[PDB]
Amino acid sequence: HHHHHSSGVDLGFQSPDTPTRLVFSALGPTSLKVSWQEPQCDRALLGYSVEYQLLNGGEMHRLNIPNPGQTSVVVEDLLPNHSYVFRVRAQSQEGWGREREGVITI
């Protein structure tokens, strides 16, 4: 099978760089804005993937962010006083850059 990006471009080397430190901003008691800086790449970025989970284990949630210009996402329904790990990496046509990890206690 041939997998394509959400934008339609075909997938499949100089990888994207790693994003800088993740910035977290609370929007209420259970909602969190996660922001980063677009990393450099010789090629066009297609977007980002954001994965997060409780540090102590739990279901891994994954979000695909299909705009290279979209460098933030708001996550909802988080558990107060629980610690999470977020990992963000940039995607190009040729593959994935390395992940930037950031952790936070809600």
Residue numbers in the entry: 1438 to 1449, 1455 to 1548
Give sentences copied directly from the paper behind this entry.
While α6β1 is expressed in the early stages of myelination and is crucial for the radial sorting of axons, α6β4 is predominant in the late stages and mature myelin. The two basal lamina receptors of mature myelin, α6β4 integrin and dystroglycan, known to be together responsible for myelin stability, are according to our results bound to the same scaffold protein, L-PRX, at the Schwann cell abaxonal plasma membrane. The third cytoplasmic fibronectin-type III (FNIII) domain of β4 integrin (β4-FNIII-3) was identified as a high-affinity binder, and the complex was characterized using biophysical and structural biology techniques. We have shown here with a collection of methods that L-PRX binds, through its C-terminal region, directly to β4-FNIII-3 with high affinity.
To aid in structural modeling and understanding the interactions in the complex, we solved the high-resolution crystal structure of the rat β4-FNIII-3 domain. The structure is similar to the human β4-FNIII-3 domain, consisting of a β sandwich made of seven β strands. In two of the four monomers in the asymmetric unit, the His tag could be partially seen in electron density, being in different conformations. The β4-FNIII-3 crystal structure was used to model the solution structure of the complex, which cannot be crystallized due to the flexible nature of PRX and the fact that the exact binding site remains unknown. The structure of β4-FNIII-3 can be used to predict the binding site for PRX. A surface analysis of the domain crystal structure indicates an elongated hydrophobic groove lined by β strands 4 and 5, which could accommodate a linear motif, possibly in a β conformation; this would extend the smaller β sheet from 3 to 4 β strands. MD simulations of the structure further show that this region is the most mobile segment of β4-FNIII-3, and the cavity can open even more. Furthermore, although the FNIII-3 and -4 domains of β4 integrin are rather homologous, sequence conservation in the possible binding site is very low—in line with the observation that FNIII-4 does not bind to PRX. Thermal stability of the proteins was studied using label-free differential scanning fluorimetry (nanoDSF), whereby the signal came from the folded β4-FNIII-3 domain. β4-FNIII-3 has the same melting point (+70°C) in the presence and absence of PRX-C, suggesting no large structural changes are induced by PRX-C binding. A dissociation constant of 1.7 ± 0.1 μM was obtained for the protein-protein complex using ITC, with a binding stoichiometry of ~1, being in good corroboration with the light scattering data above.
